[PDB]
UniProtKB/Swiss-Prot annotation, chain A:
Quaternary data: Heterotetramer. Forms heterotetrameric channels composed of two GluN1/zeta subunits (GRIN1), and two identical GluN2/epsilon subunits (GRIN2A, GRIN2B, GRIN2C or GRIN2D) or GluN3 subunits (GRIN3A or GRIN3B) (in vitro). Can also form heterotetrameric channels that contain at least two GluN1 subunits and at least two different GluN2 subunits (or a combination of one GluN2 and one GluN3 subunits) (in vitro). In vivo, the subunit composition may depend on the expression levels of the different subunits. Found in a complex with GRIN1, GRIN3A and PPP2CB. Found in a complex with GRIN1 and GRIN3B.
Entry PTM: Phosphorylated on tyrosine residues.
Record: residues binding Zn(2+): 10
Role noted for this protein: Component of N-methyl-D-aspartate (NMDA) receptors (NMDARs) that function as heterotetrameric, ligand-gated cation channels with high calcium permeability and voltage-dependent block by Mg(2+). Participates in synaptic plasticity for learning and memory formation by contributing to the long-term depression (LTD) of hippocampus membrane currents. Channel activation requires binding of the neurotransmitter L-glutamate to the GluN2 subunit, glycine or D-serine binding to the GluN1 subunit, plus membrane depolarization to eliminate channel inhibition by Mg(2+).
Domain writeup: The extracellular N-terminal domain (ATD/NTD) endows NMDARs with a unique capacity for allosteric modulation, harboring several binding sites for small molecule ligands that act as subunit-specific allosteric modulators of ion channel activity. A hydrophobic region that gives rise to the prediction of a transmembrane span does not cross the membrane, but is part of a discontinuously helical region that dips into the membrane and is probably part of the pore and of the selectivity filter.
Origin species: Rattus norvegicus (Rat)
Similarity field: Belongs to the glutamate-gated ion channel (TC 1.A.10.1) family. NR2B/GRIN2B subfamily.
Location in or out of the cell: Cell membrane; Postsynaptic cell membrane; Late endosome; Lysosome
Tissue: Expressed in the hippocampus including the dentate gyrus (at protein level). Detected in adult olfactory bulb, brain cortex, hippocampus, striatum, thalamus, superior colliculus, with much lower levels in inferior colliculus, midbrain and cerebellum.
Lineage: superkingdom: Eukaryota
Protein name per its UniProtKB record: Glutamate receptor ionotropic, NMDA 2B
From Swiss-Prot, chain B:
Protein's name in the database: Glutamate receptor ionotropic, NMDA 1
Free-text function comment from the UniProt entry: Component of N-methyl-D-aspartate (NMDA) receptors (NMDARs) that function as heterotetrameric, ligand-gated cation channels with high calcium permeability and voltage-dependent block by Mg(2+). NMDARs participate in synaptic plasticity for learning and memory formation by contributing to the long-term potentiation (LTP). Channel activation requires binding of the neurotransmitter L-glutamate to the GluN2 subunit, glycine or D-serine binding to the GluN1 subunit, plus membrane depolarization to eliminate channel inhibition by Mg(2+).
Source organism: Rattus norvegicus
Residues of the full protein shown: 103 to 153 of 938
Free-text tissue specificity from the UniProt record: Detected throughout the brain, in brain cortex, cerebellum, thalamus and olfactory bulb.
PTM comment, free text: NMDA is probably regulated by C-terminal phosphorylation of an isoform of NR1 by PKC. Its phosphorylated state is influenced by the formation of the NMDAR-PPP2CB complex and the NMDAR channel activity.
Annotated family: Belongs to the glutamate-gated ion channel (TC 1.A.10.1) family. NR1/GRIN1 subfamily.
Assembly and binders: Heterotetramer; the NMDAR subunits are modular and harbor tiered domains that function in concert to regulate opening and closing of the cation-selective ion channel pore. Forms heterotetrameric channels composed of two GluN1/zeta subunits (GRIN1), and two identical GluN2/epsilon subunits (GRIN2A, GRIN2B, GRIN2C or GRIN2D) or GluN3 subunits (GRIN3A or GRIN3B) (in vitro). Can also form heterotetrameric channels that contain at least two GluN1 subunits and at least two different GluN2 subunits (or a combination of one GluN2 and one GluN3 subunits) (in vitro).
Domain notes: A hydrophobic region that gives rise to the prediction of a transmembrane span does not cross the membrane, but is part of a discontinuously helical region that dips into the membrane and is probably part of the pore and of the selectivity filter. The extracellular N-terminal domain (ATD) is a site of allosteric regulation to modulate overall receptor function.
Record's subcellular location: Cell membrane; Postsynaptic cell membrane; Synaptic cell membrane; Postsynaptic density membrane
Top-level lineage group: Eukaryota
Length: 49, 51
C-alpha cells in the first residue's frame, strides 16, 4: 500500500512462509525453510544419517 | 477489494466469518483464521466441469 522497503531479522517472525503480495517491498529473514532442509541434508551427510 | 478489513480485524484470533465475497484467496488457512464462503469461488467451477 505504501511502496516502501522494510527489512529485518526480528522477533516472532522466525522464517515466516506466506503468500505475500507481488507489489510489496520487503525482504527479511535469512535462509529459506528448504535451504534449511538443505543444511539438514548436509548434516545427515556428515554421519550418514 | 473485500480484503483489507479482513486482514486488520483478522489479527485478533477471530473465528470463521461468512461474507459473500469474491476471495479465491480464502484457502490460505494461516493468513486467515476467519474466512468462509457463501458462494463458490472463481476456481470452484472445476468439479462443475468434471461432471
Amino acid at each position: 500500500q505504501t511502496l516502501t522497503p522494510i527489512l529485518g531479522i526480528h522477533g516472532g517472525s522466525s522464517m515466516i512462509m506466506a503468500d505475500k503480495d507481488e507489489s510489496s517491498m520487503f525482504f527479511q529473514f535469512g535462509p529459506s525453510i528448504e535451504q534449511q532442509a538443505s543444511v539438514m541434508l548436509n548434516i545427515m551427510e556428515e554421519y550418514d544419517w | 477489494t473485500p480484503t483489507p478489513v479482513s486482514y486488520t480485524a483478522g489479527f485478533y484470533r477471530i473465528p470463521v466469518l461468512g461474507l459473500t465475497t469474491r476471495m479465491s484467496i480464502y484457502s490460505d488457512k494461516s493468513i486467515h483464521l476467519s474466512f468462509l464462503r457463501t458462494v463458490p469461488p472463481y476456481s470452484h467451477q472445476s468439479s462443475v466441469w468434471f461432471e
